[PDB]
Amino acid sequence: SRSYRETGTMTVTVDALNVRRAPNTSGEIVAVYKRGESFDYDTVIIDVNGYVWVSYIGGSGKRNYVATGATKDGKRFGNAWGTFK
């Protein structure tokens, strides 16, 4: 995967997305965003064949990760799971 710094806002457009403590499907779940909720991020992780994760620092200083769509060959593939501003 490739990690980048970038600030932005995501608005969730799928029913729900898990907030995890690692950018993989085994990362500990610490929250859930629902359809229509928005949150800011400062870091983006682009899996080669996985997901685009966005990440923010929480209240305890630990980093949180949310998957935002699939990737193929290091690029977004298919429709994203939120809108971005």
The structure tokens listed for 45 are: 């992780």
Query: Is 28 buried (19+), middle (13-18) or exposed (0-12) by CB count in 10 A?
Result: exposed
Resolution of this PDB entry, in A?
A: 1.4
User: Domain locations in the chain?
Assistant: 2-79
Method used for this model? X-ray
**Could you give the CA distance from residue 59 to residue 27 in angstroms, rounded to a whole number?**
18
**Could you give the CA distance from residue 76 to residue 50 in angstroms, rounded to a whole number?**
9
Which CATH architecture group holds 2-79? Roll (2.30)
Distance of CA 36 to the CA centre of its chain: 15
Per the DSSP assignment, residues forming a β-bridge with 51 are 70
**Could you give the CA distance from residue 82 to residue 1 in angstroms, rounded to a whole number?**
20
The structure tokens listed for 31 are: 């929250």
- Beta-carbon-side half-sphere exposure of residue 82 (alpha carbons within 13 Å): 25
Nearest CA-CA partner of 10 in 31, 45, 40: 40
Which positions ≥6 away from 13 have C-beta within 8 Å? Answer: 35, 80, 81, 82, 83
